[PDB]
Amino acid sequence: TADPLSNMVLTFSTKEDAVSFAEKNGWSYDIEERKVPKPKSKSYGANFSWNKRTRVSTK
Amino acid sequence: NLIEVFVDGQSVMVEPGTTVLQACEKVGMQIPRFCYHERLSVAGNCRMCLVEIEKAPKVVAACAMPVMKGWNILTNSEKSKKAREGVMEFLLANHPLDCPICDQGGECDLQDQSMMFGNDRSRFLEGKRAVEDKNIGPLVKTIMTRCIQCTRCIRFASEIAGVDDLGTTGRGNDMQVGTYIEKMFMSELSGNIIDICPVGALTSKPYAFTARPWETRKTESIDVMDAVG
Amino acid sequence: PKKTSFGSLKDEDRIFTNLYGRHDWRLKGSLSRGDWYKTKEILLKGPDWILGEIKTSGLRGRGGAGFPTGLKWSFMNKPSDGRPKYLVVNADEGEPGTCKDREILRHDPHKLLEGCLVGGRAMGARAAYIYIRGEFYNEASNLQVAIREAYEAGLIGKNACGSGYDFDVFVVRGAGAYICGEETALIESIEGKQGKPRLKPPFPADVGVFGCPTTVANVETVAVSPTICRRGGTWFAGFGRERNSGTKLFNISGHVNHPCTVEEEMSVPLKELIEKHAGGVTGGWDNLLAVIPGGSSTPLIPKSVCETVLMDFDALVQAQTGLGTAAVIVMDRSTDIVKAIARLIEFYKHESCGQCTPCREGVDWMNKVMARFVRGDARPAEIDSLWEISKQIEGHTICALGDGAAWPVQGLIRHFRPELEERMQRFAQQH
Amino acid sequence: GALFVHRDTPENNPDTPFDFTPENYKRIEAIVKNYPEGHKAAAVLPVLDLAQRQNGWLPISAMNKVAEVLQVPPMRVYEVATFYTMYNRKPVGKYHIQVCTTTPCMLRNSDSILEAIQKKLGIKVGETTPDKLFTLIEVECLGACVNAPMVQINDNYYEDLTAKDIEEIIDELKAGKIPKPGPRSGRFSCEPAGGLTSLTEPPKGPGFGVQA
Amino acid sequence: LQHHDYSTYTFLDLNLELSKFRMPQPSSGRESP
Amino acid sequence: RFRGEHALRRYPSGEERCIACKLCEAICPAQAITIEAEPRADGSRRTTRYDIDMTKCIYCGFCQEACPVDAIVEGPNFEFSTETHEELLYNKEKLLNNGDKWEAEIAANIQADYLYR
Ligand SMILES: Cc1cc2nc3c(=O)[nH]c(=O)nc-3n(C[C@H](O)[C@H](O)[C@H](O)COP(=O)(O)O)c2cc1C
Ligand code: SF4
Ligand code: SF4
Ligand code: SF4
Ligand code: SF4
Ligand code: SF4
Ligand code: FES
Ligand code: FES
């Protein structure tokens, strides 16, 4: 390994928290957004129905 | 607008329709699962979703039963735990003893949830079944033995891949999801099935034996192999 | 009736003459029976009073479910939603202890056909789908012939014997699918989908075959129904105990001098038909220790509780026994029981497909455990562990095949535990 | 029968040609007429019977052929041919004996019927005879439990057979067509000879049904 | 004697004979997968 | 029981016991061990470069316990001081040789001890 500090890792309760740390400490940083998956409507029968062209097949 | 249903104690403005799964997963509580998948389709096989409603005479399938007002869902309640124990005792009643040689065995979901649930000791006394290997492609080795009749892979395959070579075969004991005939499965998204396999049934050949998950760093970015970005 | 007296039953109380094949199963024989009676007039273009006639009939599920068929059929008073509605008839007759639906089709298709017409009308059904076994080929042809006789007479087909209500039956067959004995498995069989039953966030009433709404009923209920709609259903309601209104076929079977099927008042004492219709078991009734109510599915009955139980299923529930289409398999004491129940659970393992894991694995496992038991190699405590397995099978399995898969050995534990230990000691003594 | 996969490709049916008779096309089309136009698939199960009815056995060529017929992916036909046992994926003899040994018949000592069939034939139960005719096999409850052990030979229901009666059946199999009743002891139409109680009155007139 | 003693082909033929008696099947809607 | 020099060891058949399960890599408290599991031409999982340095080994003897296939063994030998540091940084090779010289002995001690574990 070259850089000693390379294995560092740090949890934070919030984003502004981490930004505040990098500001306190003087290092430059790059903020990134949270990625909660968007909700998906689902239903057991939605698989079926002749008209909806979901159908699936044998089960 | 939204129907009210109670997570254990808290009232919840849950969406009309929608499964108990998404209900518990709104407060953040997370139901144990296998065959179900978040962007696939519900299937009643492998009922790890079992939970009892507050007035339920007997346990419901949380991944499937639509929510409705007046229900309350004690996920932490004992009977649900007895249910999950009921699942895990059975999945392991005949599973192969090959965690160590499993490429998924360093990170299999069956393991984490084997830790979360199911009695620590087993009570097998006979002879487990073991299916023969069933090649379906140069770049997607399939050990089988390991696949838990969970059918997430056919619902992926038959659908989004568009190819239907994969599927169920037989009934009763020694039933198997091994695809009919020698012919290889092929698709332009053939490899993604590897990810979707809960166990080591669908280990990729090129990456086989190469590594173990914990050791790896996970540096992130984007590919440029497609313009899809 | 209302009194403890039972075993009585008038022949003309029976809805089913030509039960044994005499007096012509041919449509001319149905006419000799005057079966088409007021069948055209029943079709007054409005369910309700016939549906209420069945609600007042006191009639319940003849599929062994025992579920109130009047309420079950009440469900499709609903608007058709623009998707055609169908009635599916359960004729699987793959279930053990059950030869009841066999001879009736062999000797009285017609009352059933009138039942398809009346009950199909009650559903507002576009058609009248009917399953047949692949084991049942020749019989499917017999029924196809009688149905053709129904076509030529115009009694079915367009308008169907007047009234103007269009009505086409559709005979259907399977192949080795005992699980299609379960209704939704059969509904799945109709699409060409494999007969592995649906989980039901929506009921079959809500969504049926091809996505178009449907309904189902056992052959007995739907066949009795037109006569319920003609002869007073209250008259049907008079027999037996009130919740157990009507009559039921009693398939006495196994070790007995004269095994037979006898439709009879719901609440006769179980020993009576053995001492009557069955002619008594060989070596006398005293030999009996184990005889099972239900279609080789419900838990075993010891002779002590057996003397008291009435054939109606509620008495069985107090005996901790389900209806099980009231099939009766006698088992003489001289034979070992554990081999029999093990053979039964083996029968389940061969037939449980295996969609949801708990029942597949549960039977695949419990079978092998039974092999260890019957071989006598097993430790005495092990049986109790089997009980635990049963507890994880019951309310967890998506379908009731696992329930009947679990119960008989539960009874074998609960009563024959000392017998089990006694068997194990003998294997212990060999060394 | 663990070979569900059909990974094997025997020369007996790799790409061996096979075709339905035109009458069969008319029949399966009639079946299409039996079922709603939006889903040919309802017809899948019956065609496989007919495909076997022509043969008594189903070559893979029959499978992908039928898949061509209803215009549905072959895997459907594979899964359905496979899930349902009555279809025969191994070629058989002229007869397909499938004696029950299920408990209602087991108490009735159906197993003795089995040793009788073996001692007569010398077949190891399930194995095809060199004679290419008999194919004995044990089978689960056929649902004629009320009577006795039964031997449904190619949908020819037989009951109350004694081992000597089995001698009669097997010898008659080489002798000509067999009568196909219920009990063979002397009883018929399931009726007990010991009393014939139950229904007793012949008429059943169209009466009593007035309700109003 | 027997109620049944049929040819192997019999069922689909008896089925076909009554095809004229059949009311037309629904087209449902979507048809081509 | 005594702990000492490490040695990889074979099946009675003469195949190496190692399957590269790489949990013994997850346990070595000083993390002396390094493993690159790769497929055999025969297809079996096999380490291509198992190695350990006695410089960082703390002889806790975890790995003797941890291995599912009972591959690596903390052998009897103890006397092996070297003239140079390099002779300490063992390859899989040297460990195999160590399993070669002592296999009679090692298997013998395991024959004495195995019930306790
Ligand atoms: C011939 C026959 C076989 C059946 N087999 C099964 C079975 O194996 N498992 C099961 O859960 N239910 C079985 N059922 C019951 C069905 O689940 C369904 O509820 C029943 O057929 C409907 O009864 P009903 O018509 O009296 O309402 C069977 C019913 C019939 C008529
Ligand atoms: S799959 Fe998960 S559990 Fe089964 S072996 Fe591989 S790792 Fe162990
Ligand atoms: S791959 Fe094997 S295990 Fe993963 S889902 Fe498909 S079947 Fe179940
Ligand atoms: S539970 Fe077991 S038996 Fe009942 S349907 Fe699901 S799989 Fe078939
Ligand atoms: S001992 Fe052999 S198998 Fe166990 S981890 Fe170290 S190398 Fe892999
Ligand atoms: S000897 Fe002790 S320290 Fe060195 S590897 Fe084996 S366990 Fe880890
Ligand atoms: S979570 Fe998909 S069924 Fe249990
Ligand atoms: S019990 Fe064997 S066929 Fe009915």
mmCIF file of C-alpha atoms in Angstrom, chain B:
data_model
loop_
_atom_site.group_PDB
_atom_site.id
_atom_site.type_symbol
_atom_site.label_atom_id
_atom_site.label_comp_id
_atom_site.label_asym_id
_atom_site.label_seq_id
_atom_site.Cartn_x
_atom_site.Cartn_y
_atom_site.Cartn_z
ATOM 1 C CA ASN B 1 -57.534 8.430 1.149
ATOM 2 C CA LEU B 2 -55.075 5.768 2.260
ATOM 3 C CA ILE B 3 -56.437 2.937 4.420
ATOM 4 C CA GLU B 4 -55.321 2.755 8.053
ATOM 5 C CA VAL B 5 -53.701 -0.441 9.403
ATOM 6 C CA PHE B 6 -51.607 -0.887 12.572
ATOM 7 C CA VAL B 7 -47.995 -1.994 12.559
ATOM 8 C CA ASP B 8 -47.646 -3.759 15.949
ATOM 9 C CA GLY B 9 -48.626 -0.554 17.763
ATOM 10 C CA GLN B 10 -48.264 2.393 15.390
ATOM 11 C CA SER B 11 -51.143 3.311 13.114
ATOM 12 C CA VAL B 12 -50.159 3.420 9.451
ATOM 13 C CA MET B 13 -51.611 5.300 6.479
ATOM 14 C CA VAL B 14 -51.036 2.345 4.189
ATOM 15 C CA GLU B 15 -51.817 2.430 0.449
ATOM 16 C CA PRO B 16 -55.085 0.928 -0.841
ATOM 17 C CA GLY B 17 -54.537 -2.655 -1.891
ATOM 18 C CA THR B 18 -50.826 -3.517 -1.332
ATOM 19 C CA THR B 19 -49.305 -6.432 0.578
ATOM 20 C CA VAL B 20 -48.608 -6.716 4.312
ATOM 21 C CA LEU B 21 -44.990 -6.827 3.187
ATOM 22 C CA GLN B 22 -44.943 -3.213 2.040
ATOM 23 C CA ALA B 23 -46.931 -2.306 5.135
ATOM 24 C CA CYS B 24 -44.322 -3.577 7.601
ATOM 25 C CA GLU B 25 -41.646 -2.234 5.301
ATOM 26 C CA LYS B 26 -43.095 1.262 5.528
ATOM 27 C CA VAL B 27 -42.254 1.544 9.237
ATOM 28 C CA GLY B 28 -38.993 -0.130 8.263
ATOM 29 C CA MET B 29 -39.740 -3.526 9.789
ATOM 30 C CA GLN B 30 -38.539 -6.207 7.407
ATOM 31 C CA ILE B 31 -40.157 -9.585 6.783
ATOM 32 C CA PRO B 32 -37.966 -12.642 6.112
ATOM 33 C CA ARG B 33 -38.268 -13.924 2.557
ATOM 34 C CA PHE B 34 -36.837 -15.917 -0.321
ATOM 35 C CA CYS B 35 -38.906 -16.576 -3.429
ATOM 36 C CA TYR B 36 -40.526 -13.163 -3.403
ATOM 37 C CA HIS B 37 -38.673 -10.361 -5.126
ATOM 38 C CA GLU B 38 -39.120 -6.590 -4.956
ATOM 39 C CA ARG B 39 -39.423 -5.981 -8.680
ATOM 40 C CA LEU B 40 -40.544 -9.428 -9.778
ATOM 41 C CA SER B 41 -43.916 -10.941 -8.864
ATOM 42 C CA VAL B 42 -45.527 -12.481 -5.812
ATOM 43 C CA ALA B 43 -45.590 -16.270 -5.533
ATOM 44 C CA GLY B 44 -47.057 -18.336 -2.722
ATOM 45 C CA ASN B 45 -44.346 -20.977 -2.702
ATOM 46 C CA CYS B 46 -41.791 -20.871 0.127
ATOM 47 C CA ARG B 47 -43.918 -19.214 2.783
ATOM 48 C CA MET B 48 -41.236 -17.481 4.848
ATOM 49 C CA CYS B 49 -43.614 -14.521 4.979
ATOM 50 C CA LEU B 50 -45.857 -16.123 7.578
ATOM 51 C CA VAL B 51 -47.172 -13.802 10.304
ATOM 52 C CA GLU B 52 -50.325 -13.694 12.387
ATOM 53 C CA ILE B 53 -52.678 -10.725 12.250
ATOM 54 C CA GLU B 54 -53.771 -9.472 15.669
ATOM 55 C CA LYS B 55 -57.124 -11.216 15.336
ATOM 56 C CA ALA B 56 -55.857 -13.962 13.045
ATOM 57 C CA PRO B 57 -56.920 -17.529 13.949
ATOM 58 C CA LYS B 58 -53.861 -18.590 11.949
ATOM 59 C CA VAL B 59 -50.884 -16.994 10.202
ATOM 60 C CA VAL B 60 -51.121 -15.028 6.946
ATOM 61 C CA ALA B 61 -48.681 -14.594 4.067
ATOM 62 C CA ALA B 62 -47.290 -11.118 4.712
ATOM 63 C CA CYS B 63 -45.728 -10.827 1.275
ATOM 64 C CA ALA B 64 -49.101 -11.319 -0.380
ATOM 65 C CA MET B 65 -52.191 -10.582 1.707
ATOM 66 C CA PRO B 66 -53.471 -7.108 0.783
ATOM 67 C CA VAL B 67 -53.781 -4.720 3.709
ATOM 68 C CA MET B 68 -57.169 -3.649 5.025
ATOM 69 C CA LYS B 69 -58.378 -1.431 7.847
ATOM 70 C CA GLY B 70 -58.700 -2.732 11.404
ATOM 71 C CA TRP B 71 -55.833 -5.211 11.150
ATOM 72 C CA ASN B 72 -52.818 -5.141 13.433
ATOM 73 C CA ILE B 73 -49.525 -6.882 12.789
ATOM 74 C CA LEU B 74 -47.261 -8.050 15.593
ATOM 75 C CA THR B 75 -44.277 -9.136 13.503
ATOM 76 C CA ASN B 76 -42.290 -9.741 16.676
ATOM 77 C CA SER B 77 -45.060 -11.961 18.069
ATOM 78 C CA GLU B 78 -44.168 -15.512 19.044
ATOM 79 C CA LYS B 79 -46.388 -17.364 16.610
ATOM 80 C CA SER B 80 -44.762 -15.684 13.631
ATOM 81 C CA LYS B 81 -41.423 -16.749 14.989
ATOM 82 C CA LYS B 82 -42.678 -20.322 15.322
ATOM 83 C CA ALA B 83 -43.678 -20.032 11.706
ATOM 84 C CA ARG B 84 -40.284 -18.875 10.511
ATOM 85 C CA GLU B 85 -38.787 -21.687 12.546
ATOM 86 C CA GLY B 86 -41.159 -23.922 10.663
ATOM 87 C CA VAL B 87 -39.721 -22.730 7.371
ATOM 88 C CA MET B 88 -36.061 -22.881 8.264
ATOM 89 C CA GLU B 89 -36.292 -26.331 9.873
ATOM 90 C CA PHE B 90 -37.530 -27.610 6.570
ATOM 91 C CA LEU B 91 -35.322 -25.811 4.100
ATOM 92 C CA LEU B 92 -32.307 -27.226 5.906
ATOM 93 C CA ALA B 93 -33.851 -30.656 6.369
ATOM 94 C CA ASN B 94 -32.276 -31.682 3.056
ATOM 95 C CA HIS B 95 -29.878 -28.904 2.027
ATOM 96 C CA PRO B 96 -26.350 -29.900 0.895
ATOM 97 C CA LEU B 97 -23.555 -29.655 3.479
ATOM 98 C CA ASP B 98 -21.480 -27.438 1.255
ATOM 99 C CA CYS B 99 -21.279 -23.896 2.526
ATOM 100 C CA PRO B 100 -17.466 -23.848 2.144
ATOM 101 C CA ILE B 101 -17.278 -24.855 -1.508
ATOM 102 C CA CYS B 102 -20.240 -22.623 -2.383
ATOM 103 C CA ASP B 103 -19.328 -19.432 -4.225
ATOM 104 C CA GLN B 104 -22.500 -17.963 -2.711
ATOM 105 C CA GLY B 105 -21.702 -19.724 0.528
ATOM 106 C CA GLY B 106 -19.718 -16.800 1.858
ATOM 107 C CA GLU B 107 -22.779 -14.581 1.620
ATOM 108 C CA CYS B 108 -25.884 -16.658 0.930
ATOM 109 C CA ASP B 109 -29.148 -15.105 2.086
ATOM 110 C CA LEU B 110 -30.135 -18.515 3.385
ATOM 111 C CA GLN B 111 -27.232 -18.212 5.810
ATOM 112 C CA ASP B 112 -28.006 -14.764 7.177
ATOM 113 C CA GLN B 113 -31.568 -15.740 7.709
ATOM 114 C CA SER B 114 -30.430 -19.084 9.114
ATOM 115 C CA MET B 115 -28.731 -16.965 11.733
ATOM 116 C CA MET B 116 -31.713 -14.725 12.250
ATOM 117 C CA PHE B 117 -34.068 -17.708 12.608
ATOM 118 C CA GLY B 118 -34.475 -21.450 12.979
ATOM 119 C CA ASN B 119 -33.237 -23.678 15.778
ATOM 120 C CA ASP B 120 -29.471 -23.876 16.113
ATOM 121 C CA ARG B 121 -29.498 -27.692 16.130
ATOM 122 C CA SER B 122 -30.895 -29.968 13.431
ATOM 123 C CA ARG B 123 -32.561 -33.378 13.714
ATOM 124 C CA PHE B 124 -31.870 -35.119 10.409
ATOM 125 C CA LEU B 125 -31.319 -38.880 10.631
ATOM 126 C CA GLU B 126 -31.627 -40.393 7.138
ATOM 127 C CA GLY B 127 -30.433 -39.562 3.615
ATOM 128 C CA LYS B 128 -30.846 -36.216 1.854
ATOM 129 C CA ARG B 129 -31.586 -36.055 -1.854
ATOM 130 C CA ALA B 130 -29.094 -34.573 -4.319
ATOM 131 C CA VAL B 131 -29.834 -33.714 -7.960
ATOM 132 C CA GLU B 132 -27.326 -34.004 -10.803
ATOM 133 C CA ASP B 133 -25.792 -30.879 -12.328
ATOM 134 C CA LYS B 134 -27.638 -29.357 -15.273
ATOM 135 C CA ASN B 135 -25.566 -27.097 -17.537
ATOM 136 C CA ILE B 136 -27.409 -24.255 -19.213
ATOM 137 C CA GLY B 137 -24.538 -22.118 -20.446
ATOM 138 C CA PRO B 138 -20.744 -21.638 -20.642
ATOM 139 C CA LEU B 139 -20.887 -18.457 -18.584
ATOM 140 C CA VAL B 140 -23.477 -19.440 -15.959
ATOM 141 C CA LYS B 141 -22.549 -22.637 -14.108
ATOM 142 C CA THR B 142 -25.385 -24.235 -12.168
ATOM 143 C CA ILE B 143 -24.519 -26.489 -9.246
ATOM 144 C CA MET B 144 -28.158 -27.054 -8.295
ATOM 145 C CA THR B 145 -28.693 -29.373 -5.341
ATOM 146 C CA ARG B 146 -28.670 -26.016 -3.647
ATOM 147 C CA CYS B 147 -31.723 -24.340 -5.345
ATOM 148 C CA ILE B 148 -34.607 -24.045 -2.961
ATOM 149 C CA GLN B 149 -37.709 -24.669 -4.963
ATOM 150 C CA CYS B 150 -38.025 -20.916 -4.755
ATOM 151 C CA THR B 151 -39.083 -19.869 -8.205
ATOM 152 C CA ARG B 152 -37.751 -16.344 -8.458
ATOM 153 C CA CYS B 153 -35.564 -17.386 -11.374
ATOM 154 C CA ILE B 154 -38.283 -18.717 -13.674
ATOM 155 C CA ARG B 155 -40.384 -15.631 -13.056
ATOM 156 C CA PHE B 156 -37.369 -13.618 -14.053
ATOM 157 C CA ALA B 157 -36.501 -15.848 -16.953
ATOM 158 C CA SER B 158 -39.868 -16.572 -18.499
ATOM 159 C CA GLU B 159 -40.669 -12.895 -18.318
ATOM 160 C CA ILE B 160 -38.071 -10.186 -18.625
ATOM 161 C CA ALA B 161 -35.518 -12.348 -20.410
ATOM 162 C CA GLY B 162 -38.351 -13.368 -22.709
ATOM 163 C CA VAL B 163 -36.839 -16.830 -23.027
ATOM 164 C CA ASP B 164 -38.784 -19.702 -21.513
ATOM 165 C CA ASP B 165 -36.369 -22.629 -21.729
ATOM 166 C CA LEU B 166 -36.116 -22.527 -17.927
ATOM 167 C CA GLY B 167 -38.856 -23.907 -15.696
ATOM 168 C CA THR B 168 -40.385 -26.445 -13.323
ATOM 169 C CA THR B 169 -40.158 -30.174 -14.001
ATOM 170 C CA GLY B 170 -42.030 -32.863 -12.054
ATOM 171 C CA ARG B 171 -44.028 -33.147 -8.827
ATOM 172 C CA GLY B 172 -43.896 -34.661 -5.370
ATOM 173 C CA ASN B 173 -40.502 -35.652 -4.043
ATOM 174 C CA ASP B 174 -37.600 -35.296 -6.467
ATOM 175 C CA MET B 175 -39.453 -32.526 -8.234
ATOM 176 C CA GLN B 176 -37.001 -30.129 -9.835
ATOM 177 C CA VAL B 177 -36.779 -26.775 -11.584
ATOM 178 C CA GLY B 178 -34.056 -28.140 -13.807
ATOM 179 C CA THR B 179 -34.926 -27.067 -17.336
ATOM 180 C CA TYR B 180 -36.097 -29.698 -19.784
ATOM 181 C CA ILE B 181 -33.588 -31.168 -22.293
ATOM 182 C CA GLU B 182 -29.842 -30.633 -22.724
ATOM 183 C CA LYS B 183 -30.206 -27.366 -24.621
ATOM 184 C CA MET B 184 -28.547 -24.310 -23.100
ATOM 185 C CA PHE B 185 -30.495 -21.340 -21.880
ATOM 186 C CA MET B 186 -29.356 -18.215 -23.672
ATOM 187 C CA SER B 187 -30.251 -14.557 -23.365
ATOM 188 C CA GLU B 188 -28.726 -11.113 -23.752
ATOM 189 C CA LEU B 189 -29.399 -10.747 -20.037
ATOM 190 C CA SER B 190 -28.367 -14.299 -19.217
ATOM 191 C CA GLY B 191 -25.976 -13.254 -16.473
ATOM 192 C CA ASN B 192 -28.374 -11.353 -14.270
ATOM 193 C CA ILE B 193 -29.976 -14.588 -13.139
ATOM 194 C CA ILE B 194 -26.786 -15.192 -11.194
ATOM 195 C CA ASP B 195 -27.529 -12.228 -9.001
ATOM 196 C CA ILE B 196 -31.098 -13.224 -8.526
ATOM 197 C CA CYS B 197 -30.252 -16.639 -7.133
ATOM 198 C CA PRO B 198 -30.644 -16.658 -3.335
ATOM 199 C CA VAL B 199 -28.137 -19.500 -3.037
ATOM 200 C CA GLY B 200 -25.146 -20.918 -4.869
ATOM 201 C CA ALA B 201 -27.296 -22.730 -7.385
ATOM 202 C CA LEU B 202 -26.465 -20.237 -10.136
ATOM 203 C CA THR B 203 -22.782 -19.423 -9.571
ATOM 204 C CA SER B 204 -21.060 -17.756 -12.523
ATOM 205 C CA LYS B 205 -18.379 -19.931 -14.093
ATOM 206 C CA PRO B 206 -15.853 -17.170 -14.891
ATOM 207 C CA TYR B 207 -15.850 -15.885 -11.306
ATOM 208 C CA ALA B 208 -16.041 -19.335 -9.746
ATOM 209 C CA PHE B 209 -13.717 -20.159 -6.853
ATOM 210 C CA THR B 210 -11.892 -16.910 -7.468
ATOM 211 C CA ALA B 211 -12.780 -15.061 -4.287
ATOM 212 C CA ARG B 212 -14.798 -14.575 -1.126
ATOM 213 C CA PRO B 213 -17.108 -11.590 -0.592
ATOM 214 C CA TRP B 214 -15.845 -10.209 2.699
ATOM 215 C CA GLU B 215 -12.309 -9.712 1.475
ATOM 216 C CA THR B 216 -13.390 -7.542 -1.427
ATOM 217 C CA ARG B 217 -13.492 -3.762 -1.493
ATOM 218 C CA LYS B 218 -16.497 -2.350 -3.345
ATOM 219 C CA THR B 219 -15.278 0.643 -5.337
ATOM 220 C CA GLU B 220 -18.162 2.317 -7.149
ATOM 221 C CA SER B 221 -18.709 4.125 -10.464
ATOM 222 C CA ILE B 222 -20.456 3.544 -13.800
ATOM 223 C CA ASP B 223 -19.700 1.339 -16.818
ATOM 224 C CA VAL B 224 -19.151 2.717 -20.309
ATOM 225 C CA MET B 225 -19.578 -0.640 -22.039
ATOM 226 C CA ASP B 226 -23.100 0.509 -22.885
ATOM 227 C CA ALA B 227 -24.222 4.030 -23.688
ATOM 228 C CA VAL B 228 -26.965 3.204 -21.193
ATOM 229 C CA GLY B 229 -24.580 4.523 -18.553
#
